[model samples]
Target: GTILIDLSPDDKEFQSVEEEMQSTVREHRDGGHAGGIFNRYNILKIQKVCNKKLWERYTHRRKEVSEENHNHANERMLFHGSPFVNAIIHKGFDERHAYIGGMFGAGIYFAENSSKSNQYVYGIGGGTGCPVHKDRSCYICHRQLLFCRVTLGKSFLQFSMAHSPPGHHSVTGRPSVNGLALAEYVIYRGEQAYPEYLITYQIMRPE
Candidate 1:
C-alpha cells in the first residue's frame, strides 16, 4: 500500500506570508542590496523568530501526541515531515541574501543515550559568510519541560546547543573558546500569522 500523507488545508495566511517573502526578495534584488528594512540581518531575525516558535509549538504537539499514542507518533506524520531537520533546508541562495550560511546541512539526534530521559537533538551546520565556518547545534535542554519567561510578555524554553570548530583543530597555539549555539525560541502569540516560532541562533567565532 502506498503511504498516504495528511496535509493541512491550504492556509491563506501562510500563502500570503510566503508571497510577501518572495516579493521582498524581488524587491531586494531589484534594489541592488541598497538600504532596506529587509536586509540580510533583518531577514535572519524574522526567520529566526518564525522558525524557533514553529519548532517549539511542533515539539509540544509531538510530545502530546506521542504520550497519548504510546510513543508511536511518527514525525513525518505529525509535522508533515521532520519539522526542524527538514524545514529550514538549503534550496538555493542566489536571489535572497543568505543568513547563517544558507542552511548548508542539518540533522536530528539524541542529546544523550539514556533509557530513562526524554531528550533529543536538532542540529544545523553552515557558515555565516564570516571569516570562519559555524554550525548551530540544538538539544533538548528542556530541564523542566516548561517554558521560562525571560522578559515581560515574552516566554521561551532553553535548549542547550553549541558551536565548535569542525574537523581537526590546527596546531596553532592560540586558545579558542567553544561557542554555544544559543537559540532562543520565543512563543509568538500574534494572530496575524499562523501559530509559529521566533528563534535565533548565535554561534561565536572560532579561532
Candidate 2:
C-alpha cells in the first residue's frame, strides 16, 4: 500500500527543496533559451514516491555494488525530469523506456544540475506558468523532476559513447566532447537507481 506523499510548504525540507530548484536553475537560466517560453523557476511542492518494491531492488543492487567496490557504493542523489511521472512512480526507472535522448546511452539519464534535467520535463498543462490569478496557489503549470539515489560505484568517464560501456557501473558524460553542458549520469541497470522524490514546480522564467 503506497502512495505519493507531498511535503508541505511548512516542512523545512520543503523550503530546502524549493531553494534547490531556484539555486540549480540559476546558472543556466539565461544561457540562451531553448524550446521557447523564457522565464525563471520556483518550486511548488515535492511528492515523495514510496515504492517499497523498487527500493528493495535498489537496495539489493547497492549491496552488490558495495561488495564489489571495497565497501563503497559510490552513491549520490541526482536529478531527472520526465513526462511519465506516474509510470516511474509505479515501475521505477525502466531501461526499456529510457529513450527520449540517448546521447549518453540508452539508459536512465540523470544530472547533477537540476537545470539540465528540467529540459526533459513534460510540463503539465502544456504551459510555463499560471493562466488565471497571479498567485503561486492558483494551480499553475507544473513540471516534474525526480531526485534519485544513483549507485555510481565505478563509473565510466565517457569522452565518447556506447550503451553501458564495458566494466563500468555508470556513465558520466564528458562535457567538452559530448555536447553536454553539465555532467549527466547514465546507468544501464534500472536497479541502479531509485526515484525517491518527485518535485512539482512552476516553470516560470524571467522574460
Candidate 3:
C-alpha cells in the first residue's frame, strides 16, 4: 500500500516545488504564438507520497542501470497528469493505464511545464473527460498533477513517433505539430518514473 502525507502551504519542501511549477508556467506557453494571459493554477492541496515497496524497487532498478560506462541516466522531476489520481500512489506508474498511444510512442508522458500537464489534468486536450469535473464551463476546475522523478537514460529528440524501439532510453518530443504545447518527455518503462507528489489545484480558465 501507499500513503499521502498532507503538506501545509508553508512547508519548506512544498515551497521549492511550488516555485518550480510557477516559474515554468510563467516562462512560456503554446510556443509563443498565443500565450499572453499566462494560464496558471493555485495550489489547493499537496500530498507527499510514501511507498516503501515502490521505492525499494525503483532504487534497485536504477542501480542496475547505472553499471557500465552509462553511470548517469540524467534523472529529472517531471509532471504527469491523468485520471484516477488515487491508484498511482499505490500501484505506481503502470503504463498499462495509458492507451496504445502518445506522440513519441506508447510510453508514459511527462512534461517540464505545468500548463502542458494542466491540459490533461482538467479533462481538456488529450484527457478528454478524465477528471470527471462538473459542467460549470470555465468558472473552475479541480485537477491534479503528478510530480515524478523520471530517468532519461540518454534521451533522443524526435518529431515523429518511434515506430521501432528507440536506441535511447527515452524520447524528447520536438515542438513540431502543435508547437510547445506538444513538448514532452516519453519514457518507455514504468520504473523510470516515480511519482513523488500529488498537487490538487484549480484554475479559472484553460490555457
Candidate 4:
C-alpha cells in the first residue's frame, strides 16, 4: 500500500522587501534596459530562497494589499529574481508551511505564515470547484491522495516518486490529463532528529 499526499505548484517561494530590489534597480542601477538582459529574476534582494518562504511573502503581501483600495503607489510584487512575473501562485497553509516549505522548493504550505502554529493545516487554492482542465465537465483525479511506506529492509521509499508522480496526468479530468503536484522531503534549519521530512501530495483545497 502507498501513503497518500497532495502537492501543488505553490510549494515554496520568497523575495525582498527593499526598494533596491525592484525591477527599475536592474534596469537603471547598472545600466538601462537598452542592451543588458536587466535580469529581473535576479533583482529580488532575497532571491528564490525557497517555495514556502516565497509563498508566505506573497500571502502577507496579499493581505496588506487587500485592506487598501489603491496602495499601488507604494510597493510592488513584480519580478521573480529580477524579471516581471506573468502568473504567480503560492501555498496557503498558514504558518508552519512557510517555515517547513521554506526549506523545500514549494508545496501546499508555501502560502502560510511563520508566526502561527501548524494546526488544521489544510491546503489552499485549487480553484473554485472540482478541478477540470480546459473544459469544465470532467472531475480532477490528478489531485488524488497518495500513500507510501519506507522501511529499512523493505525499502518503502521506492514508492515515493510513484505516489506524487511529479508531472503525471489524470486520464479522467476534462482535459483527460491533469498533472500531479511535485514535492519531496526537506530539512529546515530548525528541524532536528527527524531531519528530513516529506512534502506529501496533500491538496491545498479539496477540489
Q: How many clashes (backbone N, Cα, C below 3 Å) per candidate?
A: 8, 4, 0, 40
Window of ten residues with lowest summed lDDT in model 1: 112-121
Over the stretch 1-207, how does candidate 1's per-residue lDDT look in tens digits? Answer: 111122222655434333333232212122321111122211122121233444454455445545644564332100101123222222211112112322221111111111101111121221122123221211111111101111111111222311212421101111133232112221112110121212221221223
- Number of residue pairs clashing in candidate 2, backbone atoms closer than 3 angstroms, sequence gap of 3 or more or interchain: 4
Q: What is the per-residue lDDT of model 2 for residues 61-143, given as tens digits with 9 covering 90 to 100?
A: 99998888798889988888776767877887785547545777578788877777766664322224233542322335666
Give one digit per residue, the lDDT tens place, for model 4 in 60-88: 54444333424331221211110101112
Relative to the true structure, candidate 4 has a C-alpha RMSD (angstroms) of 21.3
- Candidate 4 has what TM-score? 0.16
Which tens-of-lDDT digit does each residue in 33-126 have in candidate 3?
Answer: 2222335667788889999988877776676556521798678898887764577778977766453556566777888877667656534253
> Which 10 consecutive residues of model 2 have the lowest summed lDDT?
122-131
Model 3 clashing-pair count: 0
Q: Give Cα distance to truth, residue 158, candidate 3, Å.
A: 1.1
What C-alpha RMSD separates each model from the true structure?
18.0, 5.0, 4.2, 21.3
> What is the TM-score of each predicted model, taking all chains together?
0.18, 0.80, 0.80, 0.16
